[PDB]
Amino acid sequence: MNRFWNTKKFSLTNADGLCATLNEISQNDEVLVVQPSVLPVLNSLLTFQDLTQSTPVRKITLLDDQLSDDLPSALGSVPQMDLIFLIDVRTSLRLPPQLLDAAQKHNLSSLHIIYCRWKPSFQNTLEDTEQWQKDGFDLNSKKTHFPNVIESQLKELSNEYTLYPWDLLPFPQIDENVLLTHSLYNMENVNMYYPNLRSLQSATESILVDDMVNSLQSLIFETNSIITNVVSIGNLSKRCSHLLKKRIDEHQTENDLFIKGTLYGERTNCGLEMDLIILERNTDPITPLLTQLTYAGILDDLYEFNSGIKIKEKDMNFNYKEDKIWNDLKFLNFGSIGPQLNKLAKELQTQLQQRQAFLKNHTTLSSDVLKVVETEEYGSFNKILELELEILMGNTLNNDIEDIILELQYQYEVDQKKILRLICLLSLCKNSLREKDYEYLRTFMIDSWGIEKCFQLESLAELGFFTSKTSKSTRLQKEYRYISQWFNTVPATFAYSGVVPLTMRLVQMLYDRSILFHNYSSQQPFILSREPRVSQTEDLIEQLYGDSHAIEESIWVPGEDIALVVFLGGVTMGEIAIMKHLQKILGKKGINKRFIIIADGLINGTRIMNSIS
Amino acid sequence: ALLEKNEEARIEQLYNLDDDSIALKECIKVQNYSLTISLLIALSKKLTNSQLTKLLIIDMFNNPLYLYYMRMDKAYLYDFYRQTDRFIDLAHVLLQQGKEQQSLHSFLPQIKDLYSQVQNSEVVNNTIEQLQRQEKLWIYQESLGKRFAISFTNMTLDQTLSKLIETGQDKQVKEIVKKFKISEKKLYHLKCKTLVEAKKDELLQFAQGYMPFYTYLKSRGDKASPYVNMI
């Protein structure tokens, strides 16, 4: 807020707007009807008690076909004032049929709905006071617009179209530092980047990039920032950067270009820098599939977080704004939790009961997790780690891989997803697999897991995960054993099998070429540069991607620090753990910066496997 | 009209002028993807209802935007694909439709014919060879499943093999090995896999494998005396 990104301050605006709208609906007893996908987000913002006390609504429901049978049971009952639906139409451009069938059948006499949208900063605070009646109606907005958007398909029943545009802007839930935008799923639980229908990839990609650009524009115009340097990586990031630049340069108002002349300008500057490094998940498919070792990573891949940051099996919330025990243990390694918990418990003995309840709950949950790690296919949780560590450095032999893949297939029972992920990593690590092993691996797969597995192994065999030795979308076509020489991923590191992520070193090289100095270096343009630059580092990335055009460096202004590292394609939460380590080590070395990680939705190995199915 | 800088007023004017063949190009050029679907909805509702396909073949190229809008209707997605002769798309659509109501073998002959007469690639050749293997498996399943009324249907080889090993048919359970070229290593410690999962020791008379089965008997369950010193 006001050039200082007070992230928690973003939370209040959405709640205030929703409360004002709901209280301005009607001063009676209201019943709320909320879409299943958006409800968890709303509950993570407004508590039930606050919702009841602030506005006279007293009931919340869900959009389901069960309501059709309950139309004469639930909808017929209550209905003290009216029914206020809440829908999300930001993606999939289609209203759910539930409201369509309920409107005509139950014959509601008052239809009011709520639709979500990003904040229209271009409205610039209603533009003063309409310029004293538009200086004699010199400007007007009647019919100066298309008749309807998306909701033009709603042209049935009555004219009760009291729409209400509730505003929404990103706010942090999992942690103070990192915000999160939900644009990676539809209402049908289909991945927005890896859809299970290989006929409409291009449109889905365009829609995703458009929505991401819209969210970034909303945040940028809300915070009143001036981007100075852009480091785009990949193909889609190029289009995203160009579209964002065009949209910023088109829709910006006046009274700020004048400031753009005063600040920065010609022959002078004021020492303000913001960076917009952008990456794509397809660039490095090496590390969304490794096993998590941090506490929240282990707790995540065994029990999937929903849209809200909570879990079904437990009841206590993991929100950071009311508890401090979770703050200091979320990103620590699993091994260093026990003794720390023992010390925390023993120090309080000499020494309010809410802390006791919190520590008891944490101890019980940790004990349950430790118990469930073992005795549940004992040794698998470690065996996969040793196998992954062996594969990453490279120890594959002639036809011996077929012996170990089925070694744990039925000796220890294991899910399909683990095997599929491991074989994908095997096929991806060597950057190529010969033509004499697919004929056996695919045969065994189709033998053991049905007939539909052939379709999965065919569809997944074109995104780059499952390739054969015999508009490129920026795949990776270089052996990984080479990358272990330029970079020092395998020696400082946690949340993995002792391996540094590839994105980690990719962002490291932009500011300090130390590891690149040890290997493949005789001269460098610099050793410590404050501004992001890319020079004399083309050939290494020319062979790494097959084209010396993936790297893009853009300077916008002609002539401590906020860096916006967005993530198009999900964030593997282990990267968040190493981001803090990067910030700490860079601050120690001398360069002081602050990182904000924009995420389109948490991504994880198993969560990917159901996507392409 | 097109020289405007409002991104909505000029879109309205172009369509209102009855020149409804250039505003789509402008909309896809600006890449809004929100007004464009509204324009398609408005344009579809006022015309012969059959020249939409004619417009979409020449204009808009492939760009499956309107196709993505109609994804949960399963009716309009059929005739358009049939007319466009996108047989792969039709095959995938009917495959997904069959995937819904737990029935895939019913739609299998269509895939056997849709992927047939393609003459376009060689991965489809591997797919049709796999389909031939599936057909051979199905005909063998019908052949073996009707001799004894054991209710054999769908399932995979291992599912059929696991129950077949129990009360095994010697010289018949191994007969399929030469027909399907089953790997020797996989089938060695699989009969024990299918036996000791229940209450029993045939592995003792299986000495005609290697290291691993020692651990497997150690894993499940005592009675560690068998085969202590074969090495």
Curated annotation (Swiss-Prot), chain A:
Quote the function comment for this protein: Essential for vacuolar biogenesis, maturation and function. Involved in the sorting of vacuolar proteins from the Golgi apparatus and their targeting to the vacuole. Acts as a component of the HOPS complex that acts during the docking stage of vacuole fusion. HOPS is an effector for the vacuolar Rab GTPase YPT7 and is required for vacuolar SNARE complex assembly. It remains bound to SNARE complexes after vacuole fusion.
Keyword Phosphoprotein, does the record have it?
yes
Q: Report the record's Gene Ontology biological process terms.
A: endocytosis; Golgi to vacuole transport; intracellular protein transport; piecemeal microautophagy of the nucleus; protein targeting to vacuole; regulation of SNARE complex assembly; regulation of vacuole fusion, non-autophagic; vacuole fusion, non-autophagic
Q: Quaternary structure? A: Component of the HOPS complex which is composed of PEP5, VPS16, PEP3, VPS33, VPS39 and VPS41. HOPS associates with phosphoinositides and the PX domain of VAM7. Interacts with IVY1 and VAM7.
Q: What is the designated name of this protein?
A: Vacuolar protein sorting-associated protein 33
Looking up Gene3D superfamilies in the UniProt record yields: 1.25.40.850, 3.40.50.1910, Syntaxin Binding Protein 1, Chain A, domain 2
Q: What else is known?
A: Present with 830 molecules/cell in log phase SD medium.
What Gene Ontology molecular function terms does this protein carry? ATP binding
Pfam families documented for this protein: Sec1 (PF00995)
- The answer to keyword Zinc applying to this record is no
UniProtKB/Swiss-Prot annotation, chain B:
Spell out the subcellular localization from the entry.
Cytoplasm; Vacuole
Coiled-coil ranges per the record? none
Which family does the record claim for this protein? Belongs to the VPS16 family.
Complex and partners: Component of the HOPS complex which is composed of PEP5, VPS16, PEP3, VPS33, VPS39 and VPS41. HOPS associates with phosphoinositides and the PX domain of VAM7. Interacts with VAM7.
Q: What else is known?
A: Present with 1300 molecules/cell in log phase SD medium.
Q: What does this protein do?
A: Essential for vacuolar protein sorting. Required for vacuole biogenesis, stability and to maintain vacuole morphology. Required for growth at elevated temperatures. Acts as a component of the HOPS complex that acts during the docking stage of vacuole fusion. HOPS is an effector for the vacuolar Rab GTPase YPT7 and is required for vacuolar SNARE complex assembly. It remains bound to SNARE complexes after vacuole fusion.
Quote the protein name from its UniProt record.
Vacuolar protein sorting-associated protein 16
Origin organism of this chain?
Answer: Saccharomyces cerevisiae (strain ATCC 204508 / S288c) (Baker's yeast)
Which span of the entire protein is present here?
500 to 739 of 798
